[PDB]
Amino acid sequence: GSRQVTKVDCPVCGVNIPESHINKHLDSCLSRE
Amino acid sequence: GSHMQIFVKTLTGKTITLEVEPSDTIENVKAKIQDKEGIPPDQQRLIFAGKQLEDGRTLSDYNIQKESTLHLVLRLRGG
Ligand SMILES: [Zn+2]
């Protein structure tokens, strides 16, 4: 019941960002090799 | 058939202890975070050391042993 955009860390490239952008970040950041 | 404990720690800093094998599968592990905190494998995401943990693979595949600590990305996209 938290009416706010949650700010959390991207465990790949180590950046603190909003959660909508954390999810999207991963899709780019996990693309390795 | 056994159960080993691994520490899947969220971005909110909360630690979820699961009871699965290193040679089990990631698909099972994420189903067990849903079994513990009550958040589905859709709304949570498995990442160890910066690598995403694929459903078809195992913990042991991704260099994850029993009692390894890894990161869990909450999404809460359902609302
Ligand atoms: Zn990133």
UniProtKB/Swiss-Prot annotation, chain A:
Domain of life assignment: Eukaryota
Positions of UBZ4-type zinc fingers: 7-33
Residues given in the record as Zn(2+) binding sites: 10, 13, 25, 29
Cellular location(s): Nucleus; Cytoplasm, Cytoskeleton, Microtubule organizing center, Centrosome
Family the entry assigns: Belongs to the RAD18 family.
Subunit structure: Homodimer. Interacts with UBE2A and UBE2B, one homodimer binding one molecule of UBE2B. Interacts with SHPRH. Interacts with HLTF. Interacts with SPRTN; leading to enhance chromatin association of RAD18 and RAD18-mediated PCNA ubiquitination and translesion DNA synthesis. Interacts (via C-terminus and phosphorylated form) with SLF1 (via BRCT domains); this interaction is required for efficient repair of UV-induced DNA damage. Interacts with SLF2. Interacts with SMC5; this interaction is increased in a SLF1 or SLF2-dependent manner. Interacts with DNA damage up-regulated protein DDUP.
Function of the protein: E3 ubiquitin-protein ligase involved in postreplication repair of UV-damaged DNA. Postreplication repair functions in gap-filling of a daughter strand on replication of damaged DNA. Associates to the E2 ubiquitin conjugating enzyme UBE2B to form the UBE2B-RAD18 ubiquitin ligase complex involved in mono-ubiquitination of DNA-associated PCNA on 'Lys-164'. Has ssDNA binding activity.
Protein name: E3 ubiquitin-protein ligase RAD18
Annotated source species: Homo sapiens (Human)
Parent-protein start and end of this portion: 198 to 227 of 495
Curated annotation (Swiss-Prot), chain B:
Recorded name of the encoding gene: UBC
Impact upon substituting residue 79 to A: Loss of ADP-ribosylation. Impairs ubiquitination by CRL2(KLHDC3) E3 ligase complex. No effect on ubiquitination by CRL2(KLHDC10) E3 ligase complex
Modified residues (Phosphoserine): 68
Effect on the protein upon substituting residue 71 to A: Decreases affinity for UBE2R2 in ECS(FEM1C)-UBE2R2 complex. Impairs ubiquitination by CRL2(KLHDC3) E3 ligase complex. Impairs ubiquitination by CRL2(KLHDC3) E3 ligase complex
Residue window of the full protein shown: 1 to 76 of 685
Modified residues ((Microbial infection) ADP-ribosylthreonine): 69
Membrane topology, as annotated: Peripheral membrane protein
Impact reported for residue 78 to R/Q: No effect on ubiquitination by CRL2(KLHDC3) E3 ligase complex. Impairs ubiquitination by CRL2(KLHDC10) E3 ligase complex
Cellular localization per UniProt: Cytoplasm; Nucleus; Mitochondrion outer membrane
Full protein name: Ubiquitin
Position(s), cross-link Glycyl lysine isopeptide (Gly-Lys) (interchain with K-? in acceptor proteins): 79
Organism: Homo sapiens
Lineage start: Eukaryota, Metazoa, Chordata, Craniata, Vertebrata
